[PDB]
Structures are given as structure tokens and as C-alpha cells.
Structure of GymB1:
Amino acid sequence: TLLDFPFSPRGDQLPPEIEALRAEPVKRVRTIAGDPAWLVSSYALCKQVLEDPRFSLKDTSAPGVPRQYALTIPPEVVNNMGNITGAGLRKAVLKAINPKTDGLTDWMRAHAATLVDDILDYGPPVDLRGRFTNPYAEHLHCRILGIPQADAPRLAASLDIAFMNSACPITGARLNWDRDIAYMVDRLDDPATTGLMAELAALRGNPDYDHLTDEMLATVGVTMFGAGVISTMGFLTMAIFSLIQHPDVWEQLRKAPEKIPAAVDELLRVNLSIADGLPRLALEDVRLGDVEVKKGELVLVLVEAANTDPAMFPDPHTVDIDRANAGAHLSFGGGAHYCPATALGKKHAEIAIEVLLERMPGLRLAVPVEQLVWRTRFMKRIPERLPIAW
Ligand code: HEM
């Protein structure tokens, strides 16, 4: 029957399957859920799908439609950012994730210094994921949300199930969802709560927002923490791994730290942290390249193939931190559903790389690359541990 998608959980190299997709930039695949989908792999056609309102994100959660994998979340939260905007909270949300809000940029530089010094004090080797990228990501999201740093562990423990890419519903996902919601409701009335959750609590009783239940405000906190932490931890872990795989680039940034912002664009382009496709349901019959896509069919945007399309990025496998169009990568999506937290994502990664170059310039892998354990059937490619020495 059909070519199975996805291809490999290994994040050390592009799956070999990508090369054969170049002759068939729209190809029918069988998904994890066992459903047909169109896998789109050229930069031009991926951009077209992301920018065209005939390709719906919201409709991928409708009942009975072809799926990539099973939902771990209630259906209505697939269009989270739209339910957020619709409810009048967009302003509060966009403020909390702005890296210029309440000294957030200064806090990230300061806290990254603390986490790396704690690692330096213990000596090598350490698991960089467990001891740096996890807490750096989780603590950022505790600060944004206004909840205690000490609660990061209970909320992060959910994400190993929440972002699974499973053929079947997961009983653990519903139990974790209900527990994290109940926790976030408790934070609304907690006198200690600050940040986004304190601003969301304050809207209650404001006549305009009588439609906003405690569960609905709690949904904003839970989904922001989950999406934000898995994305920042996933990307940053694999951006550092890419710098370990390209020591010449690590060395360019040691001598030229002013190039770090541009280097993060080029790492967004080549990193292999995305293990799935960006899903869209066709609202209408659309010709996409050579393929007549039918109304109600599932389309998957393959970011890692788009970002290495030589038509758009000549010499695509070269990591060039001076690449003029590095910024045109699809790793933050595009069109109506473009990541709203790109300023924070970039700044978070820039600062971590800056602090590691300054305080741990001899950073290297502590194990043979083949001894990494790649997480299977998960939305991200990540090594369970990233053992490093210096
Ligand atoms: C740091 C690296 C990050 C990466 C690589 C990343 C990547 C992405 C991508 C690819 C999408 C588009 C999904 C699609 O088109 O179907 C997206 C959307 C989104 N991201 Fe990010 N993201 C990052 C950080 C964050 C953070 C820190 C937050 C914090 C709250 C966040 C919240 C969201 C939300 C709510 C959406 C949905 C947008 C919508 O439906 O309009 N992201 N992200």
C-alpha cells in the first residue's frame, strides 16, 4: 500500500526517504492513525499550504476526519490561539510571551548563568537536557505564567505523554489533563500567583468576561506551558546537538558572538527536532503542484524537507550562519497560524548559546553519537539524555 509517515525518530541526520520525495513533492502517505494524507515536501508548496485559507488547522480536530495521530487534548483546543483571541485574552497572552515584558530577557540571561554554573560545579559529564534545556524551558514558562518555579516538575512530567504521536487514545493523557487543569484553577485564587495567570484571574467579575470559566482560564495556562516548554526545550536541545555535530560553527560563534542571532535562524532551518507534519484539512478541491487534493483530505507540511529545498536554500545541507535567507525557514510555520512567540523562542535560544559559549567553550558530546537514545512516537525528535563533557 502507501509509504508510511513518519520515517525515523533518529535526529542525527535527515531521513533517507526525503531524497525520493523531491520527484513527488505532494505524495500520498499512511499516517500513524492509519489514515491517508498528502505529504508536501517542496518549499514553494509548503509555503502555499501555510498561507492559503483553503487549508484549515481548526478542521483537523473535527470528528470523523483523517488524522495524523490521536488527540491527547479535548478537540476544541486544536484551535487554542483562536479560542484565546475570541475570548478577549489575546492582549494578556501576547504581553506575557513578549521578551521585553517585566525584564524577561534579563531574567533568561541571569537564570541561564545560574543553571550552567550549577553544572560546572558538578563537573563532567552531565545530561544537558535534564540539567539545562529542561529547567531553562520549564522555568521560563513558570515565570511567564506567574506560578512557582518549584512546581515545574509536576507540570513537565505530563509532557512525555501529552506530545506522544499514537495510533490510539492514551488513558494517561486525560488523567494528566484533568490534574494540570485542577492545579491551574487553584493558581487563579492563590494570593502568590503573578504573571499571566494573575492577569487572567483579574478579568473574572469584569462584566465583559462573565463567559470565561475557571476551567477556560486554566486551559490557557496548561496549553501555554505544554506547547511553550516542548517547543523551546525540543528546539534548543537539537540546536545545541547541531552545534556539537558542526564544531566549525561552534568555533565561528566563540570568535563572533554578535553572529548568534543569525546563527539561531540557520539552526531553526537545519535542526531535526520536528518529528511530525504541520496538519491542514482541505476546505475545498485545490490543485497543489501536480495533485488534485479533494475537500476533506489531510495535508502534512514537512518542514525539514521544505527547509532543505535546494530551489530555496542552495547548498541546503551546509550550516552557513551568514546564509542571507536563513530567516525564511518554515520552523515557526507561516500564514494565519505563524508561531506568535517567535521573538521569545529566538531570544531564549540566543541567550542559552551565548551563556554556554562564554562559560563552557569546550562543550562536546560525552558519548559516541550512536549511544544517544532517540524518543520514539513523539511530536519531537529528542535524545532522552544529551551527555556532554568539557
Ligand atoms: C522556541 C521554539 C518554538 C518553535 C520552534 C515553535 C514552532 C511552532 C510552529 C511550527 C507552530 C505552527 C504549527 C502549525 O502551523 O500547525 C507554532 C504555533 C504556536 N506556537 Fe510556537 N514555537 C516555539 C515557541 C513557542 C512558545 C514559547 C510558545 C509559548 C506560549 C508557543 C506557542 C504557540 C502557539 C499558541 C501556537 C499556535 C498558533 C496558532 O494556532 O495561531 N510557541 N509554533
In short: The domain at 3-389 is CATH 1.10.630.10 (Cytochrome p450). The longest helix spans residues 214-245.
